[PDB]
A paper describes a structure:
Maintaining the optimal nucleotide balance required for normal cell proliferation is controlled by 5′-nucleotidases amongst other processes. All structures adopt a tetrameric assembly displaying a cross-like shape, in agreement with the quaternary solution structure. Each subunit consists of four domains: an “N-Terminal Regulatory Domain” (NTRD, M1 to K59), an “OD” (D60 to T143), a HAD-like Catalytic Domain (CD, F144 to K270 and K371 to Q444) and a C2 cap domain13 (K271 to N370).
This deletion mutant at pH 8 shows twofold increase in kcat(app) with a similar fold lowering of Km(app) value. As concerns the IMP-binding stoichiometry, we observed that in the PfISN1D172N-IMP structure, each subunit binds one IMP-Mg2+, a feature also observed in the PfISN1D172N-ΔN30-IMP structure. We also showed that whereas residues 30–59 are directly involved in the catalytic mechanism, residues 1–29 rather contribute to a global stabilization of the structure during conformational changes associated with catalytic function. The crystal structures confirm that the IMP-Mg2+ substrate is mainly coordinated by conserved residues from the four HAD motifs, and by W365, which is situated on β-strand I. The base moiety of the nucleotide is stabilized by a π-stacking interaction with W365 and by three hydrogen bonds with A205 (Motif II), S207 and D367. Hydroxyl groups 2′ and 3′ of the sugar moiety form hydrogen bonds with D363 and D178, respectively, whereas the phosphate moiety of the nucleotide forms hydrogen bonds with D170 (Motif I), T204 and A205 (Motif II), K371 (Motif III), and N401 (Motif IV).
Author numbering:
A (entry chain A): 46 to 315, 327 to 430
B (entry chain B), D (entry chain D): 46 to 316, 327 to 430
C (entry chain C): 37 to 317, 327 to 431
């Protein structure tokens, strides 16, 4: 439950864990000792993550960084640096320090090597991770990566997009993907291990034998999802719809509100861009009102791209349902997404699964390629 | 004044003038007094900007903000903040503080309202401000705004691209711009008021009357440029190329070295593979540091082009300095518009000789021209 | 916040290196605003534009301490037991020192600490009923006895109008004569000006931190209070658990002398362990090792899963832990004389984390004072209320 | 040489080089690798200290730290770290990082270990480094150190005190030290190698075989002092006096102004009523900006004492250069010990012409002299 946590310091600072490694790397780079054997510094950092893995409530990493997440695996940050260093030679610089984005690459690679025991579940944030904002799947190169990985693991698609239990509009969003599944996975027995998650934990779809997605009976997973009052989801939405009107009235912008079942959010109409900071304001506006009305149901409000949405689902709950349904632990569960800020919908997955922060679908092909290289 | 500001604080920290205003606005944000009449705070900020225009090296603003730019005009920051807030209502925010890009637009509007004495020269960075990087000018709304300004004052195009003294290749880069000039900027005497600067300050061009750009000779304006012989420019070309060859080997990049007269470059090729943004910063400082090792004082410029590196023996500030010496216009009535206003960019040296407007994409240039015409 | 068992559990376990880096989160919140106000040059003009809006959040935090904008900005705000008039506190403090005429030197942390104390004093418009004093370093130098006629005159006049107590950390088991020798000049002034009034019955002394209690006699002598009168208010602690705390602490004071080789000794008491330095033929112990050791003590106590109320603190040149804290001492006094929290104040010098008087901010108004010279300025302004 | 400027960012961080080491030591303390073999980091910092000694203008230490000074000697920062660590074990700390003041002891120890080549001139700030502010000399343990050090090198006392060229006034400050010289430093000729400087570079005294000071002839050393005429000394004295008269009114000070030939200051009334340290730091920058506004270029110094402020015609750096030219001593063989090395102190300009030990009490000076004698 991260609804209450939305500290001002938790917003202005980018990421507490990644900046923790940058500032240490900055001091190392400044001392002109970055290119020498820095395993003495990296291993002490590597040991700290281990101590946090064992005692996440009283480790020294907790005393330094107060708002750390929970580590599910032993992170070989020493091996992650050498592997990333020898490739790009980022250490060869003498005037440019390491960048936040580079340490995020090193942090992502450290969570991949920690899967030396294996990996059972792998989920993707279909939007901005597989294809740009709203575009359809057309990259045939990474479709081969997902098909080969499905033969040895479960593959799920968890996206905040909602189409209200209509397993036909999701076809056009993935038609090129299932086309590759019919050519390779249909003969194999792995096609039954591919699942599609709509809404954020409200619509689930499987995969038949003809490379098409179909709905799942509600009785097969209604018990796994902690159920929620019919009327409470309406109150959450009614609160938001009132908050967005104030936002559109408080800031004269060219957008309108869109209403759905168990999800709403404003979308700019023909489109005229809305300032990124305003959508940040609207998330904290909606959250503080949900806390005021003492609502405890799982919800989410994210600032993805140039459109704001509020779902009565949770991307972490969708990860929790599949783990409880497929009998998969958290240490053998991964997720790939882009909205990993405090106002993003992929951040809750840090509480129940390993995470990989990605900025563009190209980095996912770099992620999946390094996965099966083991 | 050689570029000696290759400091670690210059790379790590952002613009000193903008972040100075952001921190004050954040304290006005957390104090919950942002929405109330903050003119008492905004008037004192102007009081510092006025005194800095008089004593730039002894002002209280220089004591607070070091390495601060030079204000050629008195900046009306109180008006600019009022009119910006009315446009976008940034102040009504309760949980998001004023950001960096907003203050960039506020200082741009402040530097636009400062032109009460009149504008006499506009300069435009070609790539990334008039059209995307590596594109030809394809816009009719922008060319219509420029046509009206061309009758009021002189307009010039100062770019970093370089085709060796070929006016046919320059008109190809902005075809639809001369097309609009041929329809509305011929009957008036403004067609003799348009200029184009190739390289960075090495090739000068002008517009002939029959809808096509032509190249001006060298002997007419070479005396205004600083005298740098052909041997020194080639050593700058050589010590650079030796530094790039280190960068290709050091980081193993699929990058090519483009060599031309008075310019060295670093361009990749598709099998375009993207060089890492940070090795460009590292390679620029390597070339700048290597040049001053040999005690060179020739006006050069090494910059990062977002996706590539280029080192020109011309200075984008020299081009503005050349046109100021040709048209007999003081630095108070000269303005520049560019996207490379970081320490690694090439539009930054224009802070030393002209008013500067910071822009990130062509859509903001059109918004800057509309506001600059309602005067 | 919640009951005192919840706040003490977080105070001795939820510390952070970032939080311990900044002395106070609330005072630093005002320094950044005044810094930008000083940097914006607009500080010397009429800044009621900005100050009034700071009060607005201070009032909103008094009515809603858990979901206020002040709790959004500062994550670890305490709980305001009253409405702080920071606008009048700024005007009154500035009209005296005129710190706003400075052009090249911003306001400092210690100055905003003074203004915040004056704001907490002006907030006692509803009256005051209890006033407690950290004895050492606020009533007299560290380790000294009471010796200030100006301070005795202020406490005596306040004693006739309200109850007076002294919460210290010095732990003499039950020898009131040893406490009397520390304040003999204070009871001497009380004998000449307070026996005529019935105010000497309103004077109390708290030995250790909430472990021993004494009251003043009609003969100006200090006497022990019967334990059957107040032992029930204190949260009881098992004799096995207290010796568990003293032993687990005593072990680290040997490890800190082995790591750092200090010429220091370890004093062990019932419900008290100490780390004192040796004489010169007094040796000086570094301040950071003392801060380091307190974190070591606190870190080790939670590792052994002890949840009893304790207080590891830094005494400038000393390091002690006591089974009990000053917040428990205030609770017992508040339960004894039936006094609401809003009409109780406490003056001390150790208001940092790993400090002595820090738990007081959870159940009373607090004044952060550096030396007895500053203590007079607090009581002199307190007498100016009526 | 000229006295440089300052920024508000530079006034906050007392010493950039010390602060440059704390942030590195913090991340070492933060990485959990502080107590391990960190020699690889210590040797690399030395590599920058060495490369800055050989090439002070273009070094990576100059690129990282802008306001870095001139290293007259190679600084062995690695051995100074182990030596200070083995004494206090500040590295075994698990929850408190190394502090600013501990690195000061390390930088002082690193500058002491750099004197393996030898010393030729030792200089002491009399006030606050030899005795408390305004007290006569009274220590035999420190007198034995100065006496034993007067044998091997020249020792001078450079203090901002100013008694009008009469040795008796200065002697009352150094009475117990001179009586120790008669017992130990008269049988040889070591008393002839002792010097005392009244003011920053105005008054000079030598020791006599009777353990007594005498004013040296002005003709024997005044040619090294950069001449400053009566009109220029009085303009600094007046421009200062006007600043203090406003500082008294602005803050309602209970203080007075004292005027001397070549000197002026602000002292509190006798009662010794405390005067705020902040308004003292404010009066420095008030006068310093006012002096540069009137284009004054004479050597001057406005410093902030413990309980008072003073402005003197001359700086301790020029006083050192007088003695360096007097006894023909090279720069790399000079050393100085002072208490106020902040940007508003009389001992800061020493960094431009000598090595420096930064202390804060006479007990730390003994720790410096004991470590110096044990080489
Ligand atoms: O309720 C929904 N209905 C339709 N689209 C949505 C809904 N919620 C989010 N979206 C959009 O669909 C995408 C889902 O975000 P994701 O978590 O990155 O996949 C984003 O582009 C959202 O703006
Ligand atoms: O000398 C040149 N020859 C060819 N291309 C260049 C040359 N110099 C710069 N460029 C490229 O053209 C762009 C023009 O930059 P701009 O016009 O300053 O925005 C640069 O960013 C480079 O990509
Ligand atoms: O339990 C104890 N018994 C005796 N002396 C103590 C004890 N605890 C702390 N001290 C010392 O007595 C001082 C009194 O602390 P204070 O009165 O809380 O300021 C401390 O700063 C320590 O030097
Ligand atoms: O010119 C002066 N005449 C008399 N006393 C002075 C003069 N200048 C400074 N002082 C005092 O002597 C002290 C010398 O400090 P020092 O610079 O550390 O030697 C100052 O802090 C003042 O108290
Ligand atoms: Mg996404
Ligand atoms: Mg550009
Ligand atoms: Mg105390
Ligand atoms: Mg001194």
């Amino acid at each position: 439950q991260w609804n209450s946590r939305y500290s001002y310091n938790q917003l202005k600072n980018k990421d507490s864990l990644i900046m923790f490694l940058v500032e240490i790397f900055r001091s190392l780079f400044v001392s002109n000792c970055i290119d020498k054997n820095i395993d003495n510094v990296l291993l002490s950092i590597e040991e700290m993550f281990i101590d946090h893995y064992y005692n996440p409530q009283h480790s020294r990493l907790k005393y330094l960084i107060d708002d750390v997440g929970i580590f599910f695996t032993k992170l070989p940050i020493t091996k992650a640096f050498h592997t990333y260093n020898k490739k790009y030679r980022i250490t060869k610089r003498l005037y440019a320090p390491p960048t936040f984005n580079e340490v995020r690459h090193i942090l992502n690679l450290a969570q991949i090597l920690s899967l030396e025991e294996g990996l059972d579940l792998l989920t993707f944030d279909a939007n901005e991770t597989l294809y740009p904002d709203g575009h359809d799947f057309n990259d045939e190169v990474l479709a081969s990566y997902i098909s080969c990985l499905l033969k040895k693991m479960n593959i799920a698609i968890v996206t905040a997009a909602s189409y209200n239990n209509d397993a036909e509009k999701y076809q056009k969003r993935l038609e090129n993907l299932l086309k590759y599944f019919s050519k390779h996975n249909i003969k194999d027995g792995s096609y039954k291990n591919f699942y599609v998650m709509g809404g954020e934990s409200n619509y689930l779809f499987k995969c038949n034998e003809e490379a098409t997605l179909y709905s799942v009976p509600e009785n097969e997973w209604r018990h796994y999802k902690k159920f929620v009052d019919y009327d409470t989801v309406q109150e959450i939405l009614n609160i938001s719809e009132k908050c967005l009107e104030k936002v559109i009235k408080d800031f004269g912008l060219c957008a309108q509100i869109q209403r759905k079942e168990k999800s709403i959010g404003l979308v700019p109409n023909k489109n005229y861009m809305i300032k990124y900071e305003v959508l940040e304001e609207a998330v904290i506006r909606i959250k503080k009102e949900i806390i005021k009305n003492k609502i405890t149901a799982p919800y989410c409000a994210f600032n993805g791209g140039q459109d704001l949405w509020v779902d009565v689902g949770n991307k972490a709950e969708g990860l929790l349902i599949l783990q409880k349904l497929l009998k998969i632990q958290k240490k053998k569960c991964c997720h790939i997404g882009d909205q990993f800020l405090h106002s993003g919908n992929d951040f809750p997955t840090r509480f129940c699964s390993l995470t990989l922060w990605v900025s563009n679908p190209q980095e996912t092909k770099a992620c999946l390629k390094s996965i099966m290289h083991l």
